[model samples]
Target: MEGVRRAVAKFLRGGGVYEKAVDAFVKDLQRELIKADVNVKLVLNVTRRIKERALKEEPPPGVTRRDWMIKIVYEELVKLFGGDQEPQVDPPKTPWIVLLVGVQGSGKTTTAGKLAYYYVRRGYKVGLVSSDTHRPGAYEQLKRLAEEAGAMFYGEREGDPAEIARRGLEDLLSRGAEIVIVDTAGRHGHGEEARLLDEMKAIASKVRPDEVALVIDASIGQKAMGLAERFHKSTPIGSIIVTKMDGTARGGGALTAAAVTGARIKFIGTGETLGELEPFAPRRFVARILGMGDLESLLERIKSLEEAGELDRAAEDVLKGRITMRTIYRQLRAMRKLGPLGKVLQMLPGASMLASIDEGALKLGEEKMKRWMAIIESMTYEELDRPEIIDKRRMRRIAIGSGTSVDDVRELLVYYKNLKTMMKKL
Candidate 1:
């Protein structure tokens, strides 16, 4: 970041960059962004613009290269996040309803509250309506957030969440509210003909919301972009609000999706706090992209696990070449919670080269891990702890105990032995 900022300053100060220096600087930044999972199109455009301006635009006297490069990256990021810093949501003239749509478990309800709080803070007389008919407590959570924000909430009933939203919109409009937010249910599948999507569109039509924002989980990365595009085809999406950017390194994935959709990122959820919402700032994000450092939270998580005595037990078994199923289970839980092994692998010095491996193959490995866990969970504790001690008779008993065949038990034991051997080699 300092390097880029220096280049920018130099350009602004009327300094001429040598062609070699300009190429090296731009290439380094481009590589960093691409490795971060930024879209290829975005990378090409940004690098091209930077190179073009580096040769053509002269830095002001005494301005460093850092300053000129900072300006370039900052301007590009601002353009990507939102061309206008103060872009506002334009609500419909009629019952202006805003639909919050995303896949299952994307924190739609929480985002609805955040949006409500945002508008209420702007003194728009905001009303929140949760129409998640399928999910229990969806309405309650949204309503509680609305109450906490001191805004009106609708849909505390037994019927459909969509119906509640429709009624809530009318009630808010009748009460002279200017902006109304509707939280809709997630489409169970990518099916366009799914009733949930159709119902959401119906709800949107009934309220004629000015803006439809897709609330996506940042953890899913570019996958959520495809989901967003499908939703856009079903019902016009005015913009998007990417949630869960606080912890995930997949922030670059979300940015890529935003560019693909050609939709401005109006707001981003930075944390779990009630007021942690912030308008998308390009320069701050540019800093985030370049200013790579160790994530304290990941280290804290590791420390917590070790302090709880789990790490000592695992190390004892692994070093002794005697890992039990119980130890494997515990490790599996921690690994899943931590995210994919590939992610943790890429965080280390020598492991960065592995980032380019086929991600799909890695996904397959994850599935295999889950299958092994299922196989283990199906067995008895004694059988799991001492697979080598189990003979044919015991194998049959263990298979019967675990809802699996004896052959399955044998295969699992062999796989476990091979895996342990592999780890020892590692």
Candidate 2:
């Protein structure tokens, strides 16, 4: 993170040129993420896309490549952390039952208490059920926390936990609990998690809580992914809570796991205090760990793009008389900001070059944008800058890496050619 700060400061001072400066910038980012033990494939893949975007695309007329590179880096990082959306905290329905699961030492028990406290302060009647037989200490701790939080508590010092959860659910509901949190067993050891999953499945099938939350410790690094993936598959995870964020380790692995599972992280355990839990804000959390205090304002600037001045940039490329797949790349994002401005795009001569201008079509078009964006990201720098070189085999490779089909790549290429042809009318 100190390295990241220094690197960004260098970018801020400006004009170190593309090759060396970009190389140095990307290297710093790679080092920081790797240090935080972010997944290796994620580090390389995200860094690769940042470098390519920095090299292959031009900034708006007023924006320097220096600031542009920062934006690209910031963009990629936020995307890595699950984009701009905040987690959904409000229960969609009452009598919400949250089943908490994680490997041992992930702070799962404390998180149940924290959650109960959070909801009780909001005026919800909360209940906590300790179904963890392996950790009687956890049971006593949760029982104590429940009393402190003014929430009800249920636990079985002896008996099957599935039976415990089944009884506890009714016991709490019958006692007028509006929100119930089930704190389950957390297993850890060499091969113990497989059994943990079985136990999780057993209780989950029994109580069938409204939302199954997986608690994570910040320091688990790469071990987090497999753990998350297994729990996700066993129960199709609903939400996540990553504890221990106040520590040196930033929980990048947990963030990566959250991204893959599409599970919104609902809260972060920031400190040891009973009230230390916080709502998970992806952009904010990303900014802090990135050591970029100015990032939020910078994000506002980039976010103001709407057209991000990309329209003017696109016009310059048109007048400069050359087109590349990267041009489509630039336009894809530009069109994104073109949201209510389809009428504005109509005024541009080549507006119809690639897109259909309609409300219904934009909705459909956005889904393709996601796929095409993936396809574009998977392309080689040469393929992006000079498209004539891509062949059938390359298409297959890109499709595989892109989570898309060959036909999508073909469709993009065809649109590129057709758009190039349409430019003649300009």
Candidate closest to the true structure, highest TM-score: 2
What are the per-residue Cα lDDT tens digits for candidate 1 across 367-424?
Answer: 5556556767766667766778878887776666556667876765775575467446
TM-score of each model, paired residue for residue: 0.59, 0.67
Off by over 4 Å in 1: 1-24, 84-86, 89-96, 160-162, 188-193, 287-426
For 240-320, candidate 2 gives per-residue lDDT tens digits of 898997747567777777876888878888887669998877667667655556666665555455364675556446545
Evaluate all candidate structures by whole-model CA lDDT and list the values in order.
0.63, 0.77
Per-residue error at 179 for model 1, in Å? 1.5
Q: How accurate is candidate 2 locally (lDDT)?
A: 0.77
Off by over 4 Å in 2: 84-86, 188-195, 299-426
Worst ten-residue run, lDDT, model 1? Answer: 349-358
